[PDB]
Amino acid sequence: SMSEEQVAQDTEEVFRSYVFYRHQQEQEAEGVAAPADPEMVTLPLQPSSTMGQVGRQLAIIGDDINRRYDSEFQTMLQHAQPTAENAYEYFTKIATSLFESGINWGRVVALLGFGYRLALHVYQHGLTGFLGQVTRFVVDFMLHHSIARWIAQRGGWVAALNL
Amino acid sequence: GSMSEEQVAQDTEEVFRSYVFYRHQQEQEAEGVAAPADPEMVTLPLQPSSTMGQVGRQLAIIGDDINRRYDSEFQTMLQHAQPTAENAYEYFTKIATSLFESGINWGRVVALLGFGYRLALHVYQHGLTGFLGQVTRFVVDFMLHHSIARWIAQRGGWVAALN
Numbered sequence: 001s002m003s004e005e006q007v008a009q010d011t012e013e014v015f016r017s018y019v020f021y022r023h024q025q026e027q028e029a030e031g032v033a034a035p036a037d038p039e040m041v042t043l044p045l046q047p048s049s050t051m052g053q054v055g056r057q058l059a060i061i062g063d064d065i066n067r068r069y070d071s072e073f074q075t076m077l078q079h080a081q082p083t084a085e086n087a088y089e090y091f092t093k094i095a096t097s098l099f100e101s102g103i104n105w106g107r108v109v110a111l112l113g114f115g116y117r118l119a120l121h122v123y124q125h126g127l128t129g130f131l132g133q134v135t136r137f138v139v140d141f142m143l144h145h146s147i148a149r150w151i152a153q154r155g156g157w158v159a160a161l162n163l
Numbered sequence: 164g165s166m167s168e169e170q171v172a173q174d175t176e177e178v179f180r181s182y183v184f185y186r187h188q189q190e191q192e193a194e195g196v197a198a199p200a201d202p203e204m205v206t207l208p209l210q211p212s213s214t215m216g217q218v219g220r221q222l223a224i225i226g227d228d229i230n231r232r233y234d235s236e237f238q239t240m241l242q243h244a245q246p247t248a249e250n251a252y253e254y255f256t257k258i259a260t261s262l263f264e265s266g267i268n269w270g271r272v273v274a275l276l277g278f279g280y281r282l283a284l285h286v287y288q289h290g291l292t293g294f295l296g297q298v299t300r301f302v303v304d305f306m307l308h309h310s311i312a313r314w315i316a317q318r319g320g321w322v323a324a325l326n
Contacts, residue, residue: 049188158216161212
């Protein structure tokens with residue numbers, strides 16, 4: 001049976017695979033795509049692990065709700081221009097607002113997308129990459145805000161792929 | 164409701180396919196990968212969060228002595244007999260009939276899943292042509308016709324294996 005702690009550990013692996021595949025897809029597009037941090041563009045050590053495959057599948061859903069979340073995150077980041085010095089507080093504001101009226105799978109996956117976009121943003125304008133920090137923000141938020149528990153109740157991260 | 168042999172037989176495909184996925188996720192880490200694997204083995208099944216998917220996962224990760232002993236003996240057998248796609252049905256039927264001749268118990272039920280995995284792997288490795296759908300049919304049908312699905316139903320269904 002799936003524990004909240006196991007879900008929290010799995011979140012790091014899901015997120016790292018997710019960001020790799022999000023940026024792979026972004027390059028396969030029109031335009032050049034913002035440069036990504038070499039860490040974000042490094043293939044996971046075990047891309048075919050269960051959590052690697054979950055992150056991959058979540059990144060390649062191009063349904064309308066995911067594209068809507070992504071566009072709104074982009075717009076917010078372009079306006080707010082967070083930096084490495086204030087990205088923690090920015091992340092906490094956006095994530096807390098997103099879940100304030102409840103948890104659902106679309107919002108869980110949207111938080112991975114926001115982490116991807118926040119890490120990519122800070123890298124552009126910043127002195128270096130910020131992927132490890134954003135990973136900690138996402139993992140810790142999901143644990144503290146009872147999202148890891150919510151996922152565990154539903155069977156763990158693999159349940160994000162169910163219809 | 165009172166679990167039927169028909170429901171169990173229907174459930175067995177999902178149990179077996181999840182079992183195979185989680186068995187091959189361990190074999191690759193232990194043996195390395197010097198030939199491409201069967202994509203059907205290495206790709207997470209659809210609806211990976213179901214009760215039956217969870218049963219297959221738990222049975223694949225058991226890892227005690229009796230399950231290791233069944234697995235070693237199946238591998239020795241296969242390495243000697245070298246069944247092919249042309250004769251795997253007859254070879255499966257012989258091994259499975261022998262295994263259950265003197266009775267059904269949970270260790271033998273799980274052993275049959277292990278044998279199906281190893282048979283599908285062996286046949287694939289011969290030609291790099293997948294054989295998982297065929298072996299799944301062999302396992303599902305054998306359990307049904309040989310009253311193993313009914314034995315399982317009468318202990319409460321697959322979910323009894325979780326105990």
